[PDB]
Motif scaffolding. Sequence first.
Motif, PDB file in Angstrom:
ATOM      1  N   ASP A 166      34.552  41.684  66.790  1.00 42.60           N
ATOM      2  CA  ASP A 166      34.545  40.317  67.299  1.00 42.60           C
ATOM      3  C   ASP A 166      34.405  39.308  66.158  1.00 42.60           C
ATOM      4  N   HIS A 167      34.376  39.815  64.927  1.00 42.13           N
ATOM      5  CA  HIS A 167      34.260  38.979  63.732  1.00 42.13           C
ATOM      6  C   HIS A 167      35.518  39.070  62.861  1.00 42.13           C
ATOM      7  N   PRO A 168      36.065  37.912  62.451  1.00 43.03           N
ATOM      8  CA  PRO A 168      37.297  37.830  61.653  1.00 43.03           C
ATOM      9  C   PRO A 168      37.101  38.233  60.188  1.00 43.03           C
ATOM     10  N   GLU A 169      38.026  37.838  59.317  1.00 46.81           N
ATOM     11  CA  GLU A 169      37.941  38.196  57.901  1.00 46.81           C
ATOM     12  C   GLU A 169      36.919  37.349  57.151  1.00 46.81           C
ATOM     13  N   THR A 170      35.894  38.012  56.628  1.00 45.03           N
ATOM     14  CA  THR A 170      34.852  37.359  55.846  1.00 45.03           C
ATOM     15  C   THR A 170      35.160  37.458  54.355  1.00 45.03           C
ATOM     16  N   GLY A 171      35.034  36.341  53.646  1.00 50.33           N
ATOM     17  CA  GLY A 171      35.219  36.330  52.205  1.00 50.33           C
ATOM     18  C   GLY A 171      36.559  35.781  51.758  1.00 50.33           C
ATOM     19  N   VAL A 172      37.116  34.865  52.542  1.00 47.03           N
ATOM     20  CA  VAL A 172      38.389  34.244  52.197  1.00 47.03           C
ATOM     21  C   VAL A 172      38.234  32.729  52.117  1.00 47.03           C
ATOM     22  N   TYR A 173      38.483  32.173  50.935  1.00 42.09           N
ATOM     23  CA  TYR A 173      38.264  30.751  50.692  1.00 42.09           C
ATOM     24  C   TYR A 173      39.570  29.999  50.459  1.00 42.09           C
ATOM     25  N   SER A 175      39.984  27.120  48.607  1.00 43.48           N
ATOM     26  CA  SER A 175      40.109  26.595  47.256  1.00 43.48           C
ATOM     27  C   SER A 175      38.898  26.983  46.416  1.00 43.48           C
ATOM     28  N   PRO A 176      39.048  26.993  45.079  1.00 43.77           N
ATOM     29  CA  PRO A 176      37.904  27.271  44.204  1.00 43.77           C
ATOM     30  C   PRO A 176      36.742  26.308  44.444  1.00 43.77           C
ATOM     31  N   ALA A 177      37.036  25.098  44.909  1.00 39.02           N
ATOM     32  CA  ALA A 177      35.990  24.120  45.197  1.00 39.02           C
ATOM     33  C   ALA A 177      35.160  24.527  46.416  1.00 39.02           C
ATOM     34  N   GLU A 178      35.675  25.479  47.193  1.00 39.40           N
ATOM     35  CA  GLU A 178      34.980  25.980  48.379  1.00 39.40           C
ATOM     36  C   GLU A 178      34.042  27.130  48.028  1.00 39.40           C
ATOM     37  N   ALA A 179      34.533  28.058  47.212  1.00 41.73           N
ATOM     38  CA  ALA A 179      33.726  29.181  46.750  1.00 41.73           C
ATOM     39  C   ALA A 179      32.576  28.695  45.872  1.00 41.73           C
ATOM     40  N   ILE A 180      32.753  27.520  45.277  1.00 41.95           N
ATOM     41  CA  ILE A 180      31.707  26.895  44.476  1.00 41.95           C
ATOM     42  C   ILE A 180      30.560  26.417  45.365  1.00 41.95           C
ATOM     43  N   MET A 181      30.906  25.768  46.473  1.00 41.72           N
ATOM     44  CA  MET A 181      29.911  25.275  47.420  1.00 41.72           C
ATOM     45  C   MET A 181      29.333  26.411  48.266  1.00 41.72           C
TER      46      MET A 181
END
Lengths: 620, 81, 62, 711, 23, 224, 225, 48
Positions: A166-173, A175-181
């Motif tokens: 029931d949970h989708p793909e975890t760990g997909v961003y 933009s690099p500005a997202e993985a930073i936050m």
Amino acid sequence: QCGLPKLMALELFKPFVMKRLVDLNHAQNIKSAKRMVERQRPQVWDVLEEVIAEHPVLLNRAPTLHRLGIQAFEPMLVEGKAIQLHPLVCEAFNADFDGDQMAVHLPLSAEAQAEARILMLSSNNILSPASGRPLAMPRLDMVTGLYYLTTEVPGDTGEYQPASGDHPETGVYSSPAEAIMAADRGVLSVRAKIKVRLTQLRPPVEIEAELFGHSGWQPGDAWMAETTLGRVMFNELLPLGYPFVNKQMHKKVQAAIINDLAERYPMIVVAQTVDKLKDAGFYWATRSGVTVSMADVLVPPRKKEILDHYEERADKVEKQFQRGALNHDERNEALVEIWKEATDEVGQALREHYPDDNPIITIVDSGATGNFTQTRTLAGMKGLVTNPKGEFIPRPVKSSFREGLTVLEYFINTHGARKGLADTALRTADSGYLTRRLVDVSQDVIVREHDCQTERGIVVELAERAPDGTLIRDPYIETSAYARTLGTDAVDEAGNVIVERGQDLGDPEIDALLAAGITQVKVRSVLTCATSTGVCATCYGRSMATGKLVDIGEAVGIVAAQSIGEPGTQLTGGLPRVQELFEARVPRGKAPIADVTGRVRLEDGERFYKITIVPDDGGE
Amino acid sequence: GYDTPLGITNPPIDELLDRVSSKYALVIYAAKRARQINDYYNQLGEGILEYVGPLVEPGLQEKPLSIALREIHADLLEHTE
Amino acid sequence: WLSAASFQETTRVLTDAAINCRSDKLNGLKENVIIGKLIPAGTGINRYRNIAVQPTEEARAA
Amino acid sequence: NNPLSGLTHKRRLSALGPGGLSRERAGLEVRDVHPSHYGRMCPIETPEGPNIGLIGSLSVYARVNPFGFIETPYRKVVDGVVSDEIVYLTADEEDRHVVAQANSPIDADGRFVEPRVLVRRKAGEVEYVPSSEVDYMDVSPRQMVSVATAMIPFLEHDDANRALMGANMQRQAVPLVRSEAPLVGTGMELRAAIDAGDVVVAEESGVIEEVSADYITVMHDNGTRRTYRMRKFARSNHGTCANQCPIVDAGDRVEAGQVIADGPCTDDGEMALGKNLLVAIMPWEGHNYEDAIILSNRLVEEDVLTSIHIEEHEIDARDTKLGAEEITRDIPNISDEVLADLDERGIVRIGAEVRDGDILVGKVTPKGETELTPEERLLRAIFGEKAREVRDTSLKVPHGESGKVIGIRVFSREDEDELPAGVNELVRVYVAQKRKISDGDKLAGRHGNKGVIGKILPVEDMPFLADGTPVDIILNTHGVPRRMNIGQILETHLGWCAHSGWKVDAAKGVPDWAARLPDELLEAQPNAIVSTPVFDGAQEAELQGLLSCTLPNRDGDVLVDADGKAMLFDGRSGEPFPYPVTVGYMYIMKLHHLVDDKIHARSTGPYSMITQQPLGGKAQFGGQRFGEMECWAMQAYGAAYTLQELLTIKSDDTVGRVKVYEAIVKGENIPEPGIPESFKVLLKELQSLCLNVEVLSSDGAAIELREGEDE
Amino acid sequence: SNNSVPGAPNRVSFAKLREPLEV
Amino acid sequence: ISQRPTLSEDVLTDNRSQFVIEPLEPGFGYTLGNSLRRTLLSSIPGAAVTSIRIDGVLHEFTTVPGVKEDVTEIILNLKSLVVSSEEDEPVTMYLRKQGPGEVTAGDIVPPAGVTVHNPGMHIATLNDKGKLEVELVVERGRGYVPAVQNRASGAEIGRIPVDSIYSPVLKVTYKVDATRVEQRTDFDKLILDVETKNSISPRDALASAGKTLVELFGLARELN
Amino acid sequence: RPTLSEDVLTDNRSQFVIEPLEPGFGYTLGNSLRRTLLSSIPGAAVTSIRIDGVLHEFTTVPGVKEDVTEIILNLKSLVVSSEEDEPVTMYLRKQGPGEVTAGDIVPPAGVTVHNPGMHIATLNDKGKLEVELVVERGRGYVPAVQNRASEIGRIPVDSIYSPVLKVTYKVDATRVEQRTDFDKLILDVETKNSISPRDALASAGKTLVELFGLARELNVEAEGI
Amino acid sequence: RVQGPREVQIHLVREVQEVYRAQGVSIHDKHIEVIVRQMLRRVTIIDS
DNA sequence: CATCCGTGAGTC
Ligand SMILES: Cc1ccccc1NC(=O)[C@@H](Cc1ccccc1)NC(=O)c1ccc[se]1
Ligand SMILES: [Mg+2]
Ligand SMILES: [Zn+2]
């Protein structure tokens, strides 16, 4: 740049400032201007700020072993009395910060400064004239800091997770500005493997042709990757236009990237780029958590276990000699082997018992610095100590430094350490002496002409044929082939020529030859190219520094002597053999050679060896 | 495509080496022009017929070398060996 | 003999050269440094040393 | 430099000197450690330089016999029974015997535990040998070592290399404003401070009758009084500040042999060669890169690493042929602003402040009556000023020198004070400096872990512990496993335990790890002193154990763990450092390599008499040397003009240097270098050897060299 | 205690009992 | 997904007080408390001794007949002297005592608007025949100001400059209670810890710490 | 001398130069003003979505070129400002050959889509596409597991509420008077297509002025500018 | 005498290299040859 | 192939 002390500068530019003092009427003449500087009036600190404008200075650190022992810098005023240096030129001067002093020399004539900013500027001399390798490169804390964030950690927080249930793909961003936050919230680790869409980095050459067809990637074209947040921050330094790298940055890898940049991308790019690496590694060597504790340095689990095995294998040799069955020269030559083997089994014990988290190993296994032999001596055992004669002592040092050596153990180690430094003190003198000799014999050796034109050169064994199949790359290639220029068209089996004559061998040009199946190429050389005074430019080929054809007028003769004598401190044949060859002495060994080719007639005797030879072509 | 060259790195040495045979040649090229510039200023005060003045805008307290190096980059000088 | 003396065995160098009446054409690295002449290499060679730099004719005072 | 430095100097053993050997005559055999040196000559103490192996210290328990050899005490063993009877053995006497190691376990009565024991033997041989064959045993585990060697805690954890530097550097320590005793000790600290003779010991027992900063008086039991006088702010032989101060209060009952007042680098009669600093083992923003050192600004604000330095400047007045030098307040063409700090005689007033270039002793000498310039004669008739015949020859403050004038010692031949022939007044001005530590100063631990001061951040920047305590020093992790000196780590572990205090758990019995721990140590106070003797002392087990015994702060919270680490907050970013940081206390010495001294430069200046080249040494304001090897670097580069400039106008072109100077202050171009005077010297040197050397032009004619040939 | 001889501050000592002879 | 104006509570102790501040943004607490810590330890205005003078003393490096300590150690003691002054301009204190008896910070004569917060501070051990006539100058400033600066003003030869540690702060720290529960209930709770020198209050220190910061963060609100 | 404020610009971002700060105040202002820009400004982003022809994620939507994953990423990059705190819902439907953008989105009252030209999903012929969107308000960044209940095809999305994208700061030293100790803070700030960087700094500025108010109220004693 | 001037140059170059190889030192053959060249720039006088 | 006299031997 270099931090030239305020109090140092004011004296170096003394007649330069007194000039600008009577200029701006702070003094009425040159005599009062003198008193103004001597009294250190507050005005002169503002004048000196102008006087030293882009007026380069020279930093030298004795002993000067190769030409990079003197480099030019842009003087930067700084409060205090200490000269400030750049972390990269440390590899050059061989300069550590244990109280080292450097000399400062100020150029005056209009030509002098020109020679400083152009020839001797630090940001230009990035490669070693000896090997063409990067000297101005990440060295200690720098490499360790980068090795940190470029390391892919498995079960680290924020890792990519496939969808299931029931949970989708975890760990997909996005933009690099997202993985930073994400890491700043605390969800993502800078070392955990994730997928990210990038818009300002050129993908690998293997992936670009798949997602574009080499349509020419552009600052805006998106592409998916499977790396870590840290490895992404890294490539923003290379930066754009240079293909992404998805590996952990060992020193050898960091060595490769600079080397590559030094070839293709211009000098002012590599200089500012390797600058960014310095800053990066230092910020991250701080948050790397590399730290030495008594805890981190651990004594092996099989310590007394393994030692008791070889202490036992030794007492079997002690008693086998006790019956006189063994010779005395044999007994110890075997006891050496026994304990030589024992020390290794302790070395293995650490590597597996030691987590790669371990800062002591982290520093070692990242090529940041230090040997594992030091680590072994530290955590496992010292091992064998050297006899004054030089032979290996029959009795070993079973204790680690971490365990605390026994009294009698300390004594004999101390004996070795003393003889070590003594011979360390002597070889330098032999090196420096040999250095000056090499210098003198090669003074009338300069680059005088652009081309000698003689087709003469010499055979270079680039590759070794394999009996099993395929081909085997030679070990002598880089030292004997890569910097050469062809004097003969290298043709394959077909009539198709791979590399022209009058062409410098580069990295792909080798692969062009390596895959072509040609295992031998003739190349021009100093030995073969004949000119009147000195040599030409063509044969000598690529100056290891500039990475291009050597200029006309380069004093290669003295450059060469430096490149040989500088590293001559690290030997044990050793240095004598080096001197023995450069002075043409009838060698100690004096191993004979066949005066004429033919069939070998071995007729050995136990008292003496006699070798007869039957000349293949008739002969006597 | 790079970052703005700061300090003594400007003008970028790579683009400078393109208008000259080699490194060494660039030196005497630049310096002898720098000699002319410092000649011009000091001569101008009391001596006519001075060498040709700065072919670009002389920055505030810009060294004679620094002025020369820029105009080399601007291809404003002539190259003879 | 200049280069020779400033290397090794200086006292022997002079004696021989004095008898041989050996002249020294001051043209070498060691040779030039001693007398204070520009060294015969780098920017020291005539190819680069004697260089004329002039403004382009296209360039002209405003 | 410090008491220890002097003490070790007296016990030096040199092979050099008349009757001995030269340095060039010494092979590799004379220098390295010989087996016989055990208990006699230390194998650790020896210089790093080309003197190595030729200079060494004498072992602690050793003494000299009336024949000139070096004896060492051994305990006597009757038959497997260690006695208290002691006999000194020479070297070759020990050879004909068998000696047992000191730490071989001994029965309470005096018998050996194991039959076979570790045995030292002739020719450096070692083997296991039955207890019946044991003749003697060593006095102490710490027998083979020198005085300086002993003061290195956990010596057995540091390689002989860094242990060597660690010993040498201790002599190079500098006395601070006030001295702190090292938290971690070795026991040697006491006896060293006393035997140094630079502290004040009580001869006979008594009681302090009157104490002052100036002197201490002691009334004796027999009724006699003896007064010891303090050395206050005396300049040393190396410019450090030998200053002694009273320990005891008035009326304190003191006994014979007690330290009543210690001196430089001494706290409570113990060797205090430095400070106990709050260490942190972590790479920090590259400012500690390559053995560089970071400091808390607290050490500047609190004078923690501040020292005192005295200089002796001296000048005299002589009898010349133009009269005699007189020291006066009247110096030609000097305003009353520069003469402001002088008295009536011409000497600086006590307590006055001096900067470099200022005047110390106003002296003038009569100048040679040579005809003054026809361009200066004309200049003196316009302004109507008559030139004096007295040229200024006053003593001005040398470069870099500054501080306060703390003393004037005048000797006049007038006041019958016996001078050497020809001198009248002789003045000595003593100037003191209060040097706060700065960038480029050489800090060193006792484990040969040197390093210069990279950066001194403001106190707030410091990576601090949870309770808001900023660390003092940020060492670099990298340069620790490389050096094989992890004793400095153990000094930090034990150090932290010494600061917090500790307590082993006695409930359910005294633990097995602390079973070898003497009763007195199972409980320890905050800021408590300990001893870790060489080849004895703390073991890694007890240490790890004590790390868990660490007592919390005033806020009831423990600060470090059993690993030895703790969690820090980045003083700049505020975020806690991601990984646990090893923290504790280490003893740090301020060596005698200070930027104030070492920094030096030169524009123009004095010149050699013969070679007409610049002089050398900071003392003479000489410039650096561009030597043969340095020239090769130039030649390799291709900077002919730079090199040429360095060996002509920069050096010995008599007319060149003068002209280049003017060309710079006029803002003109730098001209063309001429003939080096060094060369002219050579040609005139060669000609004095019957070597008809001639310089030829392109034609073939012998040319002049600013000189002509005439008979 | 270590050197309980002159009148020195008590510096406790991890040690085996050293009573052969004082320095 | 929540909004509440932040508060500012307090848990007290005479010399040190904990300032609890909540609720705050996630991961915001650590770099928020430190923002105050760096301000306090650095730029909180206080007062201390600048220079001194002693009867019969011309410079720092000497002794006074009868006193157990020397001038240096005496100056070294006066570093820990805790003073607060209202006079923005320099003022002169006084200390005299003769014969036997110990002298302390209580024998000082603080003028109007000057107070000694720690009288039991040992200064010297005056022995018999010992006399000590001192004179001390106190000013208002901030942070750390070296001694060497007073000398070059034209200060008479009798005066001996002393280092001035104005910052009346002692030790500052903080801790953070960040609720990271998977909900819209995730926040940060700040607990700052401040300890003074009994010159001013732990609260009064943080109040002059807030007066400075606001006057700085205001220039980010003004329009171009 | 009082401090200045400067600016070197770009359309979406800019560089702010702050000088001169008292020696040791560059870093005091640094990591604090950044964490404010990336966490303390309210806006609106997507919480959860719903796709018609999706029962599980692995299979791509019938008629769409992109995968289920890559569309989420494009959607995260959608800039929207809701006027009401309470979660609103917008729909986007399109069919046939072509490309669906942000201009096709059907927004509620008081809700605006700020980049109508953003690429989303390339539809082919016979390509049907119907998606429901849940837009909330808030600050900063929120993981997807915390939006797993906002059940016939509901997908939790990474909520990027914050209207400021990425911020970096460096602190150099300027030389006032004789002292070369003073600090200089250069700040780089990139915002969305919603608010200007020059604006987002004033909001973050004013926000922090409130925080340090709670302290200053206690006495207002001394400070000089 | 056996293998001729060029060959004896190639022997020196590698045998010298073979020493620096051991201690992990890398010098390009180019520098070695420069010195080797100056070693052979002379010939003896058999007959006057 | 091994002795006897003379000349080398890191920098600040
Ligand atoms: C063999 C030797 C050569 C040079 C110097 C000292 C020594 N001998 C040792 O170091 C002995 C201890 C000893 C010293 C003097 C006289 C006799 C013995 N210890 C060892 O060789 C070893 C002791 C422990 C492990 Se190896
Ligand atoms: Mg060094
Ligand atoms: Zn050629």
